[PDB]
Design a protein around this nucleic acid. Sequence first.
RNA 1: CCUGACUGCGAGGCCUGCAAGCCGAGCAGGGGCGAAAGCCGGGCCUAGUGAACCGGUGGUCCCGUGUGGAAGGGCCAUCG
RNA 2: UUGGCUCUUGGUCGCGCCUGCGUAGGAUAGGUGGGAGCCUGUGAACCCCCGCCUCCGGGUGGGGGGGAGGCGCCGGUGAA
RNA 3: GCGGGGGGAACCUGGGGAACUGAAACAUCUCAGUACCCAGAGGAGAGGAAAGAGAAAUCGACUCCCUGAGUAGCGGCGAGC
RNA 4: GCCCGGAUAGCUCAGUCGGUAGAGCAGGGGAUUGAAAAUCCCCGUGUCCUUGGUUCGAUUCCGAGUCCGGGCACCA
Lengths: 49, 228, 71
Amino acid sequence: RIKLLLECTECKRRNYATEKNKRNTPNKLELRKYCPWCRKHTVHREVKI
Amino acid sequence: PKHGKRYRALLEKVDPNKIYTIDEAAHLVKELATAKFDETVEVHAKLGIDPRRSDQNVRGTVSLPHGLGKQVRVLAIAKGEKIKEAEEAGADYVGGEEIIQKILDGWMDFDAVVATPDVMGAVGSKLGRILGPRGLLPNPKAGTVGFNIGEIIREIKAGRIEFRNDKTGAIHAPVGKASFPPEKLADNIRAFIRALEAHKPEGAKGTFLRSVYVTTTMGPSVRINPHS
Amino acid sequence: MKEGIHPKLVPARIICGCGNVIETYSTKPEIYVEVCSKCHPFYTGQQRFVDTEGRVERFQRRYGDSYRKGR
RNA sequence: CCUGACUGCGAGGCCUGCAAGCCGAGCAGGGGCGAAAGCCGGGCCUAGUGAACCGGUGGUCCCGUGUGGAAGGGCCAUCG
RNA sequence: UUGGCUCUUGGUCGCGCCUGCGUAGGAUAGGUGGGAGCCUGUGAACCCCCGCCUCCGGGUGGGGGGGAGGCGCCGGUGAA
RNA sequence: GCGGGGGGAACCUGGGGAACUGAAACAUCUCAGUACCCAGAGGAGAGGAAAGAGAAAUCGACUCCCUGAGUAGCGGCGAGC
RNA sequence: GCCCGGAUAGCUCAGUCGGUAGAGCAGGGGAUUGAAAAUCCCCGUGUCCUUGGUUCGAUUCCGAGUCCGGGCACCA
């Protein structure tokens, strides 16, 4: 609705760690990186709504 | 009321009330027509699914060697000792890259395709307009792709047996002629619908075994019983 | 007890909380009623060796005149 | 060129009736960056936000009213 | 509590083979898939009544007039 | 020929059953199954031999006193119960 | 947030439930009409939701999304 939206980010399915980045103009691209708790760091990613 | 078929005469032996039982049903499919060669027993089946989703599709096969030397034509390409395996393990039709050329011009006398790992880029790229979505593409679960070419070939004329679904969901297999014992025929059926459990897509449910049946290839047919 | 049955005997009390639900799907129901209420039976009957009535109630009438026809 | 718009933590404090509010070196984790020191746990700062309660989803696998499951709840995240 | 009976229809899913026209296609072949053919009690597929149902033949089916054929394959046109 | 018939300070059981207030307003809730109305029995009443209790292959009619415990708990998870 | 239904031509809209994409309005072109209207005739705008998919292919059928459209459901 409001151009910013919450997104909770995902690693590669198995559990995750969250936090906004919006929505607005730049559409469906969504990737980043970010280090979880499954394993230790390793790549993580994004995904998810 | 009377049906304009002389097969009505033959229909006297063709009285498909009870689905029957497998030895005995095999006796019925023996007891269909008897003129040109042995009565042409040819298994088929189908089931309840949602074809337009691509997700439920499978089309496999596995070794059932038997004394049937004629089912599922398959071009069986190879390069060397593997050619020896093809030619001696007994396909009725085998060739190499040159036969792929004969196909590249326009030719078609085999039902499916299998080959050695070495050429698979070729058959898997050059023939895409040749094969289409017709299932001529060799498929690792279809007993095709890999070094496993040769042993499966001896099945085409002994006990090939393979599956196939699509946009109509019908499926097929070999089982044996008419003058075939019942200890081997029935076993080929039990194991084939053990194979039907072996290849049920998992999103559809219910009474998945809706039908199992046998059309003699140009002539009389018998829904065999998929149970006893 | 004149709105009881006779083969059995029946006249019960009530409260009637209305109000929402939506329990097992979301929040929790609204409720707001302390209203006491009546909740009750019925009448009708038949014949002796000529000359009767009965009163009775519903299920125990199928049962009822079964019985009493059985004399 | 990437993601440190990181998890685990926090000595010490500013403020302050309470709850809030805000700053934090330093250590482990595992990274980004330059060759290296050294930097980085959001934005140059001061507004852009809300206690609880009851629920929502995804985990954890903690409990699971005789024993075993499960319903159900808790704890983690996180939304109305 | 409250019955009968009659007429109805609408729906539901199979069943009865009761159907399949882009195009080309010895033709109006849903497809999947099967493999190179099956009957004569009408000994006929020649026509000879009628019918099924039609956006033509049609595909389909009872009548026989009975005199060993009829269609498919191969072919071949096809996206099969 | 039997019996009921009514009357009782308080107590009891059943059939009915309320608001002020309490929540610093207020309906869910509480005051409260109270007060009170009526029916009924008695010198006591009901209760009462387990289609129980609940965790021990244990207990063993019920009522009453203590403690359990203001815990387990139920709640605009607020009052409070 | 659930089920529905919706991105076909200038407009609003056909849509064999897979081989073709077009209808009233709308323009303009032209004719006669007293003149404007009205008459009547005629050439035009396209993946047919962006996309795949099953199939031989795709307005058509699967679907993911999409976004609008309506309705429902909303005890913090």
